């Protein structure tokens, strides 16, 4: 998974500018997780962190679950 | 006397809730409440009801307590909310009346001279009519018998107010049968009628067996009203009745045949049209 890791962050970029700050952030939080499952690649999570902190309550639970 | 007692769905729902509330912790027999409603020419309309804290003892069948002031100020509150509701009786969930109920009915009569007690068997769900309305009567029994209190029965039925009607219909919304009926539900209605008639005849036969064996005393009256049942049999196989029955059966059968022919011709036309359409599509594909 690590050596053959290749995720198109362009689609995540053009999605993260389309979210209107609805709850869909949580879905994005897991979507990249699916794109990064077992790849240990939180590059998007590190690069985009203010929006990562833009979500709280159970969204924080979801974000930590995605990171794990 | 009272000709009828029409019970709204609200009171039966309320007594269900009261019995569930009490028996959830206080495993006990009948729970007693008071039934309010509006009178008419002679027919009572039970509309709202409330629960009065009651206790009883199985010993001596007279150690009981139904609160007086509680009834009085529940009625005060209800009349303040709605003054059209008058005390018109009381209810208990016990399937059978107890030896105690005479005292409670007299206590209710103290609040309403024509007080009628409605037994609502919340626990059983069966053929129908979960409400039985009973009125206390007092007479010399005409034909020279020792006098007692006795609870004369008055017929009851379940009616509904428009708001209660829409409420209950929306409350079911998953098992309500079509009001148009259609063949399946008419046949099930006929089966239900047969089952109810069988159940009633079985109950009457059990009562007659009890009377004959001596376990119950011969009423000597009303029993001959059951004899009047026995005389009212139509006596089918009479020649005139048989001829008329066959005539009307054929009159209905010809209409049934005409409708069946109409349906068969319609189905044949539909099949011809469908075959033409599919052949048209097949030939137009090329």
């Amino acid at each position: 998974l690590i050596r053959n890791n290749n995720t198109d962050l362009m689609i995540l970029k053009n999605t993260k500018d389309a979210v209107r700050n609805s709850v869909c952030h949580t879905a994005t939080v897991i979507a990249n997780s699916f794109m990064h499952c077992g790849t240990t690649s939180d590059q998007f999570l590190r690069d985009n962190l203010e929006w990562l902190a833009r979500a709280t309550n159970w969204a924080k639970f979801t974000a930590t679950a995605s990171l794990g | 006397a009272v000709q009828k007692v029409v019970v709204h769905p609200l009171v039966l729902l309320s007594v269900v809730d009261h019995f569930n509330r009490i028996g959830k912790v206080g495993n006990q027999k009948r729970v007693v409440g008071v039934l309010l409603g509006s009178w008419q020419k002679k027919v009572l309309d039970v509309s709202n009801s409330f629960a009065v804290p009651f206790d009883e003892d199985d010993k001596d069948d007279s150690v009981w307590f139904l609160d007086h002031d509680y009834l009085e100020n529940m009625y005060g509150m209800f009349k303040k909310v709605n003054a059209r509701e008058r005390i018109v009786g009381w209810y208990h969930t016990g399937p059978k009346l107890h030896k105690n109920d005479i005292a409670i009915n007299e206590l209710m009569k103290r609040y309403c001279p024509n007080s009628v007690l409605v037994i609502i068997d919340v626990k059983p769900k069966d053929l129908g009519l979960p409400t039985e309305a009973y009125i206390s009567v007092e007479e010399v029994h005409d034909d020279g018998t020792p006098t007692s209190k006795t609870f004369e029965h008055v017929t009851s039925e379940i009616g509904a107010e428009e708001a209660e009607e829409v409420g209950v219909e929306h409350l079911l919304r998953d098992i309500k049968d079509t009001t148009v009926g259609t063949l399946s539900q008419r046949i099930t209605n006929q089966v239900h009628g047969l089952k109810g008639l069988n159940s009633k005849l079985l109950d009457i036969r059990s009562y007659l067996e009890k009377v004959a064996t001596g376990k119950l005393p011969i009423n000597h009256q009303i029993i001959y009203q059951l004899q009047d049942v026995f005389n009212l049999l139509p006596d089918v196989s009479l020649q005139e009745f048989v001829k008329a029955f066959y005539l009307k059966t054929n009159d209905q059968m010809v209409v049934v045949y005409l409708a069946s022919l109409i349906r068969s011709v319609v189905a044949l036309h539909n099949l011809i049209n469908n075959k033409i359409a599919n052949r048209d599509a097949e030939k137009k594909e090329g």
Binding site: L1, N4, N6, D8, M10, T26, I30, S33, F34, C37, G38, W58, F61, T62, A65, S66, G68 | -
Partner: protein
């Protein structure tokens, strides 16, 4: 599975993922449904030799789509 067996983690995870109508955090459970699409060239106990093998793609190449 590869040998036609049923993969219990996959079915379990997809079930609890479909059970996301009532709980969003269960969505990550879908991770148990993924299986890597890999073949590993391990010959000895610890050796990964650079063995060269090709495919039989008839008309053209495929796989990794778009940038």
């Amino acid at each position: 599975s590869r040998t036609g067996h049923t993969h219990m983690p996959s079915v379990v995870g997809v079930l609890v993922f479909t059970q996301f109508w009532f709980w969003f955090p269960l969505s990550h459970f879908l991770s148990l449904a993924y299986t890597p699409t890999c073949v590993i060239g391990l010959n000895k106990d610890l050796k990964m030799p650079k063995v060269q093998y090709k495919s039989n793609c008839k008309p053209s190449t495929f796989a990794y789509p778009a940038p």
